[PDB]
Write a protein that binds this ligand. Structure first.
Ligand SMILES: O=C(O)CNC(=O)C(=O)O
Ligand SMILES: [Mg+2]
Ligand code: NI
Ligand SMILES: [Zn+2]
Length: 331
């Protein structure tokens, strides 16, 4: 068995290997990358996403989200308070202000210490989930707006034609902006490209151990767990590495820098934080190996998780027994 300790693997494809996206994902899995739940892909030196980032300031962040924490430093939830619209230029200035800017630090480990010590005492503002792309249309390799769609994959594997679309999302971050512990919708893959700015630190639980994380989360968030049998689908709970280690939960960590891709694999729980002002692009995708995970994915039916239009078909076709209850949660 390749990668039996479930370590995060880092790949350096050549320009030739960067042509065929599906083939390279399958290659990474042949080497055991998926066992970690997360892999890093460093693009060949010849590649670029676009020519420059000098002209992005006029993008609008219609609904910036202030991430307000509750709990203790290592075990907390966050809720998202909606703020007034602002441009990317306005948000960048905000991120760099004395109130929000990255503190002085020695290295990524010092910054990580500071994040876990102090996160709850601040409420950073995240420009998340903005439909759009920063890839140049002429970038032909690993262009996250030109991937094969999940609807087409389902149709290729299973023969059923379904409605729905699959487009990327932009994320503008600042120091302490946080992504809560989650797997993707329908336990899909994700791919995330850090276009510019400061790093993103990731934490990940191997897919084979995801239920250990779920059991800890039910212990640590007992009211949330009584409310919903899949409350991590709400994407609000944080647990620190120290708490994970104290509870014996297998996990790994890695820092993504600008110009690097990360892939999350089906049922790979992940969480993390941004180091300072940055911009990432991410999208979900599928492969043949996903189908079995999609069929088994948990679902939130309590009403909290509320998701895209395109998840309807995935539930309807892969999980017809669950469909009626899940759709009630949608309405
Ligand atoms: O970058 C973020 O805030 C969150 N991203 C992801 O969870 C991802 O790409 O799957
Ligand atoms: Mg612009
Ligand atoms: Ni994710
Ligand atoms: Zn729920």
């Amino acid at each position: 068995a390749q990668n039996p300790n479930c370590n995060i693997m880092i790949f350096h494809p050549t320009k030739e290997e960067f042509n065929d996206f599906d083939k390279y994902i399958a290659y990474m899995e042949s080497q055991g990358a998926h066992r970690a739940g997360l892999a890093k892909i460093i693009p060949p030196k010849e590649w670029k996403a676009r020519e420059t980032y000098d002209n992005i300031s006029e993008i609008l962040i219609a609904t910036p989200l202030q991430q307000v924490a509750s709990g203790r430093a290592g075990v907390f939830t966050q809720y998202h308070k909606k703020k007034k619209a602002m441009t990317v230029g306005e948000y960048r200035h905000l991120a760099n202000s004395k109130k929000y800017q990255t503190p002085p630090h020695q290295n990524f480990e010092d910054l990580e210490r500071k994040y876990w010590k102090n996160r709850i005492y601040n409420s950073p503002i995240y420009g998340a989930d903005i439909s759009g792309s920063l890839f140049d249309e002429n970038t032909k390799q690993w262009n996250l707006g030109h991937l094969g769609t999940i609807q087409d994959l389902l149709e290729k594997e299973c023969g059923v034609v379904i409605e729905g679309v699959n487009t990327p999302y932009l994320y503008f971050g600042m120091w302490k902006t946080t992504f809560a512990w989650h797997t993707e919708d329908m336990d899909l893959y994700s791919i995330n490209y850090l276009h510019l700015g400061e790093p993103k630190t990731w934490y990940v639980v191997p897919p084979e151990h995801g239920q250990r994380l779920e059991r800890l989360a039910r212990e640590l968030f007992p009211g949330s767990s009584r409310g919903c049998g899949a409350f991590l689908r709400h994407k609000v709970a944080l647990i620190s590495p120290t708490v994970l280690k104290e509870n014996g939960i297998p996990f790994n960590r890695i820092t993504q820098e600008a110009g690097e891709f990360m892939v999350t694999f089906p049922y790979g729980y992940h969480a993390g934080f941004n180091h300072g002002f940055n911009c990432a692009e991410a999208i979900n995708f599928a492969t043949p190996r996903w189908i079995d995970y999609g069929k088994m994915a948990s679902q939130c039916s309590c009403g909290e998780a509320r998701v895209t239009f395109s998840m309807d078909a995935f539930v309807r076709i892969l999980q017809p027994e669950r469909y009626d209850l899940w759709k009630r949660g949608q309405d």
